[PDB]
């Protein structure tokens, strides 16, 4: 037999174990709130000619008054956020931010610092395993949408097993041509273009007729508890900025194209319940990182 798996699910590296307490989570929430005010202060400074909104926003964020001939860097909060982000990605990254500094910065604003208020939907499709007979070829490409190309060169029809894990809530499969799909040891229905599946139902068997290849496009939705201020668009933009800024270059770490597939890959590892808690805090830190760096480049 042959086995194929999604590339992004392979070898998820361990995550950090520092700055995950209640006080540290308050610091991440405070930074997100104050960074959002920095971006909003620019538009307020356009409606009214004054620069008071930006000076107030920057003074709270950086604990110093902005100056015309001095570069705006964000102050002590920017350094703390950058170093804290490095710690979450890998367990080998040092934790050098003192706790007394984290507690001081967390007192600037009154926020919940709570990580499980709301939820969000993540679109990565976890094709854990595709099992195929001897005379068939299977290739899996894509993470947000996965296309599985199957060709049968054998004498008769072949049965292909699909395993989508137990984490994802719903999976929608659409084929180039109508195909047959059913659960293990169940009668097979008539051919149809689209299927809606629950991954917890079990392994799925697909009939692959001899002839033209069949391509199955997979999309999945997964619900993960996140803060109420979580915004997927800002997190994804912050994830790309951190990779370009060098925050994630540590020895023996896996790399991902998106934050969406980073959190899903960690969720499918062992002790994935505990890993997602750390990853969610990293997402809010990345959301704060994006807004702060766009307002104060370099």
């Amino acid at each position: 037999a042959n086995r194929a798996t999604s590339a992004f699910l392979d070898n998820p590296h361990p995550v950090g174990v520092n700055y995950v307490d209640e006080g540290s989570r308050q610091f991440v929430a405070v930074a997100e709130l104050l960074a959002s005010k920095l971006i909003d202060s620019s538009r307020e400074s356009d409606e009214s000619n004054s620069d008071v909104p930006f000076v107030q926003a920057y003074s709270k964020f950086a604990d110093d008054n902005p100056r015309h001939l001095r570069v705006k860097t964000g102050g002590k909060m920017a350094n703390a956020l950058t170093n804290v982000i490095r710690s979450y990605y890998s367990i080998n990254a040092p934790a050098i931010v003192p706790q007394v500094e984290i507690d001081r910065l967390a007192s600037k604003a009154t926020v919940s610092g709570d990580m499980y208020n709301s939820y969000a939907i993540f679109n990565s499709v976890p094709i854990v395993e595709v099992l195929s007979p001897a005379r068939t070829t299977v290739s899996i490409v894509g993470s947000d949408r996965a296309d599985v190309t199957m060709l049968n060169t054998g004498a008769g029809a072949a049965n292909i097993t699909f395993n989508f894990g137990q984490i994802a809530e719903t999976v929608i499969l659409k084929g180039s041509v109508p195909f047959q799909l059913a659960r293990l040891n169940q009668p097979m229905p008539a051919a149809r273009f689209t299927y809606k599946l629950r991954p917890l139902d079990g392994p799925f068997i697909v009939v692959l007729p001899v002839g033209n290849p069949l391509v199955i496009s997979a999309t999945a939705a997964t619900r993960i508890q996140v803060p109420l201020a979580f915004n997927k668009a800002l997190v994804e933009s912050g994830f790309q900025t951190a990779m370009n800024d060098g925050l994630f270059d540590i020895q023996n770490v896996n790399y991902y194209s998106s934050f969406d597939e980073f959190i899903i890959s960690q969720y499918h590892a062992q002790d994935g319940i505990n890993r997602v808690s750390t990853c969610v805090i990293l997402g809010l830190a990345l959301q704060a990182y994006d807004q702060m760096r766009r307002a104060l480049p370099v």
């Binding site: 009214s48 000619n49 004054s50 008071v52 107030q56």
Partner: protein, 50 residues
């Protein structure tokens, strides 16, 4: 007074709408300002560790 309108017209207008009317006419004093806090040198009475 400045824009020559009545109280009944501006009765339903919000703060943002009112700020635009005065700013279009050339009036810039439409914003509140926060006072700056100053810390006391000593601990206040009956407020231990504060």
């Amino acid at each position: 007074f400045l824009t020559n309108t009545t109280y009944d017209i501006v009765n339903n207008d919000t703060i943002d709408v009112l700020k635009m009317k005065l700013r279009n006419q050339g009036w810039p004093f439409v914003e509140r300002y926060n006072a700056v806090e100053i810390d006391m040198s000593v601990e206040p009475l009956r407020s231990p560790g504060q």
